[PDB]
Coordinates of C-alpha atoms in Angstrom, one line a residue:
Chain A
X1 CA -1.2 -0.5 41.0
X2 CA -4.7 -1.2 40.4
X3 CA -4.2 -3.1 37.5
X4 CA -7.8 -4.3 34.9
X5 CA -7.6 -6.9 32.8
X6 CA -10.3 -7.3 29.6
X7 CA -11.6 -10.7 28.7
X8 CA -14.1 -12.4 26.3
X9 CA -15.3 -13.3 22.8
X10 CA -13.3 -11.0 19.8
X11 CA -16.6 -11.9 17.8
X12 CA -20.5 -11.3 17.8
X13 CA -22.9 -11.8 15.5
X14 CA -25.1 -9.0 14.8
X15 CA -28.7 -9.0 16.9
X16 CA -26.6 -11.0 19.4
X17 CA -25.1 -10.2 23.1
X18 CA -21.8 -9.2 23.4
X19 CA -20.5 -10.3 26.7
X20 CA -17.1 -9.3 28.6
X21 CA -15.5 -9.5 31.8
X22 CA -12.8 -7.2 33.5
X23 CA -10.8 -9.2 36.2
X24 CA -8.7 -6.7 38.9
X25 CA -5.6 -7.1 40.2
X26 CA -3.9 -4.9 43.5
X27 CA -7.0 -3.6 44.8
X28 CA -10.9 -4.7 45.6
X29 CA -13.8 -4.1 43.7
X30 CA -15.6 -4.7 47.0
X31 CA -15.8 -2.5 49.7
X32 CA -14.5 0.0 47.9
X33 CA -15.4 3.9 47.2
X34 CA -15.3 3.1 43.5
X35 CA -17.4 2.6 40.1
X36 CA -16.2 0.0 37.9
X37 CA -16.4 1.1 34.3
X38 CA -16.7 0.0 30.9
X39 CA -15.5 2.4 28.2
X40 CA -15.2 1.6 24.2
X41 CA -13.8 3.1 21.2
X42 CA -14.7 2.0 17.6
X43 CA -11.7 1.8 15.5
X44 CA -10.2 5.5 14.2
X45 CA -13.0 7.1 16.6
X46 CA -13.6 8.4 20.1
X47 CA -14.1 7.6 23.4
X48 CA -17.6 6.5 24.7
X49 CA -18.8 5.7 28.5
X50 CA -20.8 2.7 28.6
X51 CA -21.7 2.7 32.2
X52 CA -20.0 1.7 35.5
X53 CA -21.1 -0.5 38.8
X54 CA -21.2 -0.3 42.4
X55 CA -19.5 -3.2 44.5
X56 CA -23.2 -3.9 45.9
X57 CA -24.3 -3.6 42.7
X58 CA -25.9 -0.1 42.0
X59 CA -25.3 1.0 38.2
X60 CA -25.2 4.0 36.1
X61 CA -25.4 4.2 32.7
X62 CA -24.9 5.7 29.2
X63 CA -28.7 6.8 28.4
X64 CA -28.1 6.4 24.8
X65 CA -27.2 2.9 25.4
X66 CA -28.7 1.8 28.7
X67 CA -31.6 -0.2 26.6
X68 CA -28.9 -2.7 25.8
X69 CA -26.4 -2.6 29.0
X70 CA -26.4 -4.9 31.3
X71 CA -23.5 -4.4 34.1
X72 CA -23.0 -6.6 36.7
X73 CA -20.4 -7.6 39.2
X74 CA -18.9 -10.7 41.1
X75 CA -17.2 -9.3 44.2
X76 CA -15.7 -13.2 45.2
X77 CA -13.7 -13.1 41.8
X78 CA -13.0 -9.8 42.0
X79 CA -14.6 -9.4 38.7
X80 CA -17.2 -7.0 36.8
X81 CA -19.0 -8.1 33.5
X82 CA -20.6 -6.2 30.6
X83 CA -23.3 -7.4 28.3
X84 CA -24.9 -5.5 25.4
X85 CA -27.4 -7.0 23.4
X86 CA -28.9 -6.6 19.9
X87 CA -25.8 -5.6 18.9
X88 CA -25.0 -4.0 15.3
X89 CA -21.5 -3.0 13.5
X90 CA -21.7 0.7 15.6
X91 CA -20.7 -2.1 18.4
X92 CA -17.4 -3.2 16.7
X93 CA -15.0 -1.2 19.1
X94 CA -12.2 -1.7 21.4
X95 CA -13.7 -2.4 24.9
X96 CA -12.1 -1.2 28.1
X97 CA -12.8 -1.4 31.9
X98 CA -11.7 1.3 34.2
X99 CA -12.0 2.6 37.7
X100 CA -13.2 5.7 39.0
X101 CA -12.8 6.7 43.0
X102 CA -16.3 8.4 43.9
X103 CA -17.3 10.2 46.9
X104 CA -20.9 10.8 45.6
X105 CA -21.6 9.8 41.9
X106 CA -24.1 12.6 41.5
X107 CA -21.2 15.0 42.5
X108 CA -19.7 14.7 39.0
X109 CA -16.3 15.1 40.4
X110 CA -15.1 11.6 39.4
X111 CA -12.4 10.0 35.9
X112 CA -11.3 7.5 35.0
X113 CA -7.8 6.2 36.6
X114 CA -6.4 3.4 36.2
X115 CA -7.6 2.0 32.4
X116 CA -7.5 -1.6 31.2
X117 CA -5.6 -3.0 28.3
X118 CA -8.6 -2.4 26.3
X119 CA -10.4 -6.0 24.1
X120 CA -11.2 -5.6 20.1
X121 CA -14.8 -6.9 19.6
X122 CA -16.1 -6.9 16.0
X123 CA -19.5 -7.4 15.2
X124 CA -19.9 -9.2 11.9
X125 CA -22.1 -12.3 10.7
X126 CA -18.9 -13.6 9.3
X127 CA -16.8 -16.9 10.1
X128 CA -13.9 -17.3 12.6
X129 CA -10.7 -17.9 10.4
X130 CA -7.4 -18.6 12.0
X131 CA -4.1 -17.6 10.2
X132 CA -1.8 -19.4 7.8
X133 CA 1.4 -18.7 9.0
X134 CA 4.3 -18.2 6.5
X135 CA 8.5 -17.8 7.3
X136 CA 9.9 -14.4 5.8
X137 CA 13.5 -16.1 5.6
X138 CA 15.9 -13.8 6.6
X139 CA 17.4 -11.0 3.7
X140 CA 20.3 -8.6 4.7
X141 CA 19.6 -6.4 1.8
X142 CA 17.6 -3.8 3.4
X143 CA 19.5 -3.3 7.3
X144 CA 22.5 -2.5 8.8
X145 CA 25.6 -3.5 8.5
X146 CA 26.2 -7.3 9.8
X147 CA 22.2 -7.5 10.1
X148 CA 19.2 -9.5 8.6
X149 CA 15.7 -8.9 8.5
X150 CA 13.6 -12.0 8.8
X151 CA 10.1 -12.6 10.0
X152 CA 6.3 -14.3 9.5
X153 CA 3.4 -13.5 7.2
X154 CA 0.2 -14.0 9.2
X155 CA -2.2 -14.4 6.4
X156 CA -6.1 -14.8 6.2
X157 CA -7.4 -14.3 9.8
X158 CA -10.9 -12.7 10.8
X159 CA -11.1 -11.3 13.2
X160 CA -8.4 -9.0 14.8
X161 CA -6.2 -9.0 16.5
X162 CA -3.4 -11.6 16.7
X163 CA -0.4 -11.3 19.1
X164 CA 3.1 -11.9 17.6
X165 CA 6.3 -12.4 19.8
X166 CA 9.3 -13.9 19.3
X167 CA 11.1 -16.7 20.8
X168 CA 8.2 -17.3 23.3
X169 CA 8.8 -13.3 24.4
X170 CA 12.7 -13.9 25.0
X171 CA 13.7 -11.6 21.7
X172 CA 12.2 -8.3 21.8
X173 CA 15.1 -5.9 20.5
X174 CA 14.7 -5.2 16.5
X175 CA 10.6 -6.5 16.6
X176 CA 8.5 -4.8 14.3
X177 CA 4.6 -6.0 14.2
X178 CA 3.3 -4.2 11.2
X179 CA -0.5 -3.1 11.4
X180 CA -2.6 -5.5 9.3
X181 CA -4.5 -5.0 6.3
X182 CA -8.1 -5.9 5.9
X183 CA -8.2 -7.3 2.3
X184 CA -11.1 -7.1 -0.5
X185 CA -11.9 -10.6 1.1
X186 CA -12.9 -9.7 4.2
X187 CA -9.7 -11.4 5.5
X188 CA -6.8 -9.8 7.7
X189 CA -3.1 -9.9 7.1
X190 CA -0.2 -8.9 9.0
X191 CA 3.8 -9.2 8.9
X192 CA 5.9 -9.3 12.0
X193 CA 9.9 -9.0 10.7
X194 CA 12.9 -8.7 13.4
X195 CA 16.1 -7.6 12.4
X196 CA 18.9 -9.9 14.0
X197 CA 22.4 -10.3 13.6
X198 CA 23.8 -12.0 10.0
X199 CA 26.9 -13.9 11.7
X200 CA 24.5 -16.0 13.6
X201 CA 22.0 -17.1 11.3
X202 CA 23.2 -20.6 11.3
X203 CA 23.6 -20.7 15.4
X204 CA 20.1 -19.1 16.6
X205 CA 16.9 -20.2 16.3
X206 CA 14.1 -17.5 15.4
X207 CA 10.6 -18.8 15.9
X208 CA 7.6 -16.6 15.7
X209 CA 4.5 -17.3 18.0
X210 CA 1.4 -16.5 16.4
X211 CA -1.9 -16.0 18.9
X212 CA -5.3 -15.9 17.2
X213 CA -7.4 -15.8 20.2
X214 CA -10.8 -15.8 18.4
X215 CA -9.9 -18.9 16.6
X216 CA -8.0 -20.7 19.3
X217 CA -5.2 -21.0 17.0
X218 CA -1.6 -20.6 18.1
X219 CA 1.3 -21.3 15.5
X220 CA 4.8 -21.3 16.4
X221 CA 6.7 -20.7 13.1
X222 CA 10.4 -21.4 13.0
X223 CA 12.3 -19.4 10.5
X224 CA 15.2 -20.6 8.6
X225 CA 17.6 -19.2 6.5
Chain B
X1 CA -20.4 12.6 17.7
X2 CA -20.2 13.3 21.4
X3 CA -21.4 15.3 24.3
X4 CA -18.5 17.7 24.4
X5 CA -16.3 18.9 21.1
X6 CA -13.0 19.4 20.6
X7 CA -10.9 20.9 17.3
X8 CA -10.0 17.4 15.5
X9 CA -6.8 18.7 15.0
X10 CA -4.5 21.1 16.3
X11 CA -0.7 21.7 15.5
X12 CA 2.3 23.8 17.1
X13 CA 5.9 24.7 16.7
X14 CA 8.6 22.7 18.9
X15 CA 9.3 24.9 21.9
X16 CA 5.9 26.8 22.1
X17 CA 2.8 26.8 23.6
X18 CA -0.4 25.2 22.1
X19 CA -3.7 25.0 23.7
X20 CA -6.7 22.1 23.0
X21 CA -10.2 23.2 23.5
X22 CA -13.0 21.6 24.9
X23 CA -16.3 23.1 25.0
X24 CA -19.8 21.9 26.2
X25 CA -23.0 23.2 27.8
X26 CA -24.8 24.5 30.7
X27 CA -25.4 20.9 31.6
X28 CA -22.0 19.5 31.6
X29 CA -18.6 21.8 32.1
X30 CA -21.0 25.0 32.4
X31 CA -23.1 23.3 35.3
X32 CA -19.9 23.0 37.6
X33 CA -18.8 19.6 36.9
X34 CA -15.1 19.3 36.5
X35 CA -13.0 18.5 33.4
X36 CA -10.1 15.7 33.1
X37 CA -7.8 15.0 30.1
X38 CA -6.5 11.5 28.6
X39 CA -3.3 11.4 26.6
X40 CA -3.6 8.6 24.0
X41 CA -0.3 7.6 22.2
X42 CA -1.1 5.7 19.1
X43 CA -2.1 1.6 19.5
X44 CA -2.5 2.1 23.4
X45 CA -5.2 2.7 25.8
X46 CA -6.1 6.1 26.8
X47 CA -4.2 7.0 30.0
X48 CA -4.9 10.1 32.7
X49 CA -3.4 13.3 31.9
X50 CA -5.2 16.2 33.9
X51 CA -7.9 15.5 36.6
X52 CA -10.1 17.9 38.5
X53 CA -9.6 20.7 35.5
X54 CA -5.9 21.1 36.3
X55 CA -4.1 18.4 38.5
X56 CA -1.5 17.1 36.8
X57 CA -1.0 12.9 38.6
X58 CA 2.8 11.9 38.9
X59 CA 4.5 11.1 35.7
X60 CA 3.1 13.8 33.7
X61 CA 5.2 16.5 32.7
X62 CA 4.5 19.7 34.2
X63 CA 4.4 21.4 30.5
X64 CA 0.9 19.7 30.8
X65 CA -1.7 22.0 32.5
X66 CA -5.8 22.6 32.5
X67 CA -8.1 25.3 33.0
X68 CA -12.0 25.7 32.9
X69 CA -14.2 28.5 32.2
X70 CA -17.7 28.7 31.5
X71 CA -18.9 26.2 29.2
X72 CA -15.3 25.4 28.0
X73 CA -12.2 24.0 29.3
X74 CA -8.6 24.4 27.9
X75 CA -5.4 21.7 27.5
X76 CA -2.3 23.7 27.3
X77 CA 1.3 22.3 26.8
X78 CA 4.4 24.2 26.8
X79 CA 7.5 24.0 25.3
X80 CA 6.0 21.7 22.4
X81 CA 7.9 18.3 22.2
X82 CA 7.9 15.8 19.4
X83 CA 6.7 13.2 22.1
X84 CA 3.5 15.2 22.6
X85 CA 2.1 14.1 19.6
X86 CA -1.3 12.2 20.5
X87 CA -4.5 12.2 20.8
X88 CA -6.1 14.0 23.2
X89 CA -10.0 14.1 25.0
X90 CA -11.4 15.9 27.5
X91 CA -14.1 14.3 29.8
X92 CA -16.7 15.8 32.1
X93 CA -20.0 14.9 33.6
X94 CA -23.8 15.6 32.2
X95 CA -26.3 16.3 34.9
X96 CA -29.5 17.1 32.4
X97 CA -30.7 13.5 32.4
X98 CA -29.4 10.7 34.7
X99 CA -25.7 11.5 35.3
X100 CA -23.9 10.9 32.5
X101 CA -19.9 10.9 32.1
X102 CA -19.5 12.1 28.7
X103 CA -16.3 12.7 26.6
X104 CA -15.1 15.3 23.7
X105 CA -14.5 13.7 20.3
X106 CA -10.7 13.8 20.5
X107 CA -7.9 15.9 19.2
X108 CA -4.8 14.4 17.3
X109 CA -1.8 17.2 18.2
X110 CA 0.6 17.5 15.6
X111 CA 4.2 18.8 16.6
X112 CA 5.3 20.9 13.6
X113 CA 8.9 21.3 11.7
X114 CA 9.3 17.2 11.8
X115 CA 12.6 16.5 9.2
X116 CA 11.4 14.3 6.5
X117 CA 12.4 10.7 7.0
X118 CA 13.4 8.7 4.1
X119 CA 11.7 4.9 4.1
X120 CA 13.3 2.1 4.6
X121 CA 11.9 -0.7 2.6
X122 CA 12.0 -4.6 3.5
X123 CA 11.0 -6.6 0.3
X124 CA 10.2 -10.4 1.1
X125 CA 9.5 -13.0 -1.6
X126 CA 6.9 -15.9 -1.4
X127 CA 7.7 -18.6 1.2
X128 CA 8.7 -22.1 -0.8
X129 CA 6.0 -23.1 1.7
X130 CA 3.6 -20.8 0.5
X131 CA 4.3 -21.9 -2.9
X132 CA 3.8 -25.5 -2.0
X133 CA 0.1 -24.4 -0.8
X134 CA -0.8 -23.2 -4.5
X135 CA -0.5 -19.3 -3.2
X136 CA 2.3 -16.3 -3.5
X137 CA 2.2 -13.5 -1.8
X138 CA 5.0 -10.8 -2.2
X139 CA 5.2 -8.7 1.2
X140 CA 6.6 -5.0 1.3
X141 CA 6.9 -3.6 4.4
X142 CA 7.7 0.1 4.9
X143 CA 9.0 2.0 7.7
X144 CA 10.5 5.3 9.3
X145 CA 9.2 7.5 7.0
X146 CA 8.3 11.0 6.8
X147 CA 5.4 12.6 6.5
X148 CA 2.8 10.1 6.7
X149 CA 2.2 9.8 3.1
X150 CA 3.7 6.8 0.6
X151 CA 2.3 5.4 -2.5
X152 CA 3.1 2.1 -3.5
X153 CA 3.2 0.8 -6.8
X154 CA 4.4 -2.8 -7.6
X155 CA 6.0 -4.1 -10.9
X156 CA 6.1 -7.8 -13.1
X157 CA 9.3 -7.2 -14.7
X158 CA 9.5 -3.5 -15.5
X159 CA 5.1 -3.8 -16.1
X160 CA 3.2 -2.1 -13.3
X161 CA 1.1 -4.7 -11.9
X162 CA -2.2 -3.4 -10.6
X163 CA -4.4 -6.3 -9.6
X164 CA -3.9 -8.2 -6.3
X165 CA -2.5 -5.5 -4.4
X166 CA -3.6 -4.3 -1.1
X167 CA -1.9 -1.9 1.5
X168 CA -2.6 -0.3 4.2
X169 CA -2.8 3.1 5.4
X170 CA 0.4 4.7 6.9
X171 CA 0.4 4.4 10.7
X172 CA 1.9 6.6 13.3
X173 CA 5.1 4.4 15.1
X174 CA 6.4 5.0 18.7
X175 CA 9.1 7.6 16.9
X176 CA 6.9 9.9 15.5
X177 CA 7.4 8.2 11.9
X178 CA 4.9 6.2 10.2
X179 CA 4.8 2.5 8.6
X180 CA 2.9 0.8 6.1
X181 CA 2.5 -2.7 4.4
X182 CA 1.7 -3.7 1.1
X183 CA 1.1 -7.4 -0.3
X184 CA 1.0 -8.7 -4.2
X185 CA -1.3 -11.5 -4.6
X186 CA 0.1 -14.0 -7.6
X187 CA -0.4 -17.5 -8.7
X188 CA 2.7 -19.5 -8.1
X189 CA 3.0 -19.3 -12.0
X190 CA 3.1 -15.7 -12.1
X191 CA 5.7 -15.9 -9.7
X192 CA 7.9 -18.9 -11.1
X193 CA 7.2 -17.4 -14.8
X194 CA 9.0 -13.8 -14.4
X195 CA 12.2 -13.0 -13.7
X196 CA 11.1 -10.7 -11.0
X197 CA 8.6 -8.4 -9.1
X198 CA 9.6 -5.1 -7.5
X199 CA 7.7 -3.3 -5.2
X200 CA 8.5 0.7 -5.9
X201 CA 8.0 2.9 -3.2
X202 CA 7.3 6.8 -3.7
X203 CA 7.8 9.6 -0.9
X204 CA 8.1 13.1 -1.4
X205 CA 8.8 13.2 -4.9
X206 CA 11.8 10.0 -3.9
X207 CA 11.3 6.6 -5.1
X208 CA 13.1 3.2 -3.3
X209 CA 12.8 0.5 -5.5
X210 CA 13.4 -3.5 -4.4
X211 CA 13.8 -6.5 -6.2
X212 CA 13.2 -10.0 -5.8
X213 CA 13.5 -13.3 -8.1
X214 CA 12.4 -16.6 -7.8

């Protein structure tokens, strides 16, 4: 029931510093025999440990990154933080925080559990672009009997990700949010589709909630017949 | 690159036993340090699968087991299930420098014998709102197909359109089938001047073609 949540910017310019924070709940960073860690995973690649910190400040870092890594802890807020300097495209990755129960670090017995959700950071000199959200009006042709597919096209945003919910999280059945395509322009597009009863298209209201955190853009798009 | 080494892919038949290896050196696994395993379902964070060479967390089926021997370790899965398709990572500790938590590069596990699934195809025309903004995008959404390979072609009326097409790689769904999206960019004038456009999906020698008109 220890839970970890990453936060921080999704876009960093090459040569600048990447900063992330992990907020812990359900257990204490301070006064605990735990090392609080950062791990990353470039898209489609493997896991890599970045470093870990004990609540009173002692750190261990990945030797391949140590010259660029600073991990810090704020026990009063039950948070710990990562700074990675002089970034390049090689540092584009999903960044996870996690924790390790540790009796003695150098016994080398410890593992990562639990893990945070991960947050994507893209290293790029391109500017942030918010999405254009267009409704995809319902069509019955491709779906099961008495149902229709409707959705939202989330076009031309950068960087990833966008989150899409339906009716502010109330509508979850039949929702399929597809992975984005990266266009030659360097901008992403994705679509989210929900299959709903045909009979109530005139009496229910369907709204896609698009959140693009990197541009601080939120769109709630009504999808009408 | 990673400090420990795993086969990029491993395959097994349903109900049979498969192993995923993890090799290191006398500075990590061979130095006496424990090996742990993480399971990563697509699009999800890794989760602990085995700790301390052979211990299972609660919530992990007893079909998973772990062992270590010399400079290597092995994840074993009995009674292989389709739901075991995932990426698997080993992890240990290396004492050659300052004390390093190190990973293998990951193994994608395929469960053989999955039946073929034909793609479900939903094709949306450009929205009136997009056309009013002087743009036009056709959206072809492809889901529930297996194996994970499709080709998508677009047609203006009956003629292939090669320009302005962006298509995702196939991505694994939670049900082990695959999804993909294809997008055709047009001007509003192109969209309105043709009698229709089509998205044609080819999969395992069969084709599904959906067509929309202004």
